[PDB]
Amino acid sequence: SYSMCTGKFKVVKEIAETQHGTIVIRVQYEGDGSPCKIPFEIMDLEKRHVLGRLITVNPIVTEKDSPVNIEAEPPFGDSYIIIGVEPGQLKLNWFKK
């Protein structure tokens, strides 16, 4: 529940484009603490540090046996995604519409 994850992160599938208006990134976690919280932290092209909305149930990684699903209300324009601590950190460039 508490401190965020320390391991690496890895997307296992499609980053669907739900027509309601969201990206639904599915990931699997290879790391130290297995019942952590997921370090999701979307940002803009510069890093004034935030740009995007988190739509999932406020999720956590409780397995390595189970791929953590994620939903996020991105902005209809160029933008960077992010998942995981500094080393081996997912840095998706969802900068599309």
């Epitope: 890895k10 997307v11 296992v12 599938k13 980053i15 599915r26 699997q28 046996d65 189970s66 791929p67 960077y80 995604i81 840095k91 998706l92 460039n93 969802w94 900068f95």
Partner: antibody
């Protein structure tokens, strides 16, 4: 823990079909993509196709679109592989893997020989 | 189509220095801003083993010098402490545009 178990190792007469299969250990099949890579004598691996237990959608490498047909079952935690109308050298160890980013857990290759 | 060029054809390394392998795709593999070039290490009679997933990240639990180096469509695998463990053909595979196929491979030979 985790890992895939393909079935047997059969010998099939030319002009017949085989029904390979991969199975789960500690993860649901809908979890991620699952494939079928083919490998002969020394001609290193050849990705055949991926399938999605979730959607149920599978895309192949054109030049394989006529032989194979990947499948899955959630009842059973397995993804199969129908390879038909085979030829004399349509012979290889047909493997099955897991990920999207680099394949992590592969199964005990299943060798298939087409013979008379 | 999409095409890979793993180039050392077959090399014989020492038992203590930098094993250098390379793979050169034709079209680009930079997907989510991240290039999708992965490596494998298949030994005799066994299935392939994933070294590097995205061009430079090192796997679940694989010995340290094994690392990626690469661009939108041009890469290379490395192993410095080449040891009596690393005897295999190494692979190179793409996962961006559907022909998610692998190269030809390279048969590392370690001297003793």
């Amino acid at each position: 823990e985790v890992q895939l178990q393909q079935s047997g190792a059969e010998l099939v007469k030319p002009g017949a079909s085989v029904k390979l299969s991969c199975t789960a250990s500690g993860f649901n099949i809908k979890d991620t993509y699952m494939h079928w890579v083919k490998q002969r004598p020394e001609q290193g691996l050849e990705w055949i196709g991926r399938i999605d237990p979730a959607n149920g959608y599978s895309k192949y490498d054109p030049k394989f679109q006529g032989k194979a047909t990947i499948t899955a079952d959630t009842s059973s935690n397995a993804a199969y592989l129908q390879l038909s109308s085979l030829t004399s050298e349509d012979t290889a160890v047909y493997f099955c893997a897991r990920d999207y980013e680099g394949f992590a857990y592969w199964g005990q290759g299943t060798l298939v020989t087409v013979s008379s | 189509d999409i095409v890979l060029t793993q180039s050392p054809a077959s090399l014989a390394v020492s038992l203590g220095q930098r094993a250098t392998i390379s793979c050169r795709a034709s079209e680009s593999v930079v997907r989510y801003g991240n290039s999708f070039m992965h490596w494998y290490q298949q030994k005799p009679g066994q299935p392939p083993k994933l070294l590097i997933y995205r061009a430079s990240s090192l796997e679940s639990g694989i010995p340290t010098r094994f690392s990626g180096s690469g661009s939108r469509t041009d890469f290379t695998l490395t192993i410095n402490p080449v040891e009596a463990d690393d005897v295999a053909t190494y692979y190179c595979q793409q996962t961006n545009v559907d022909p998610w196929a692998f190269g030809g491979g390279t048969k590392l030979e370690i001297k003793r």
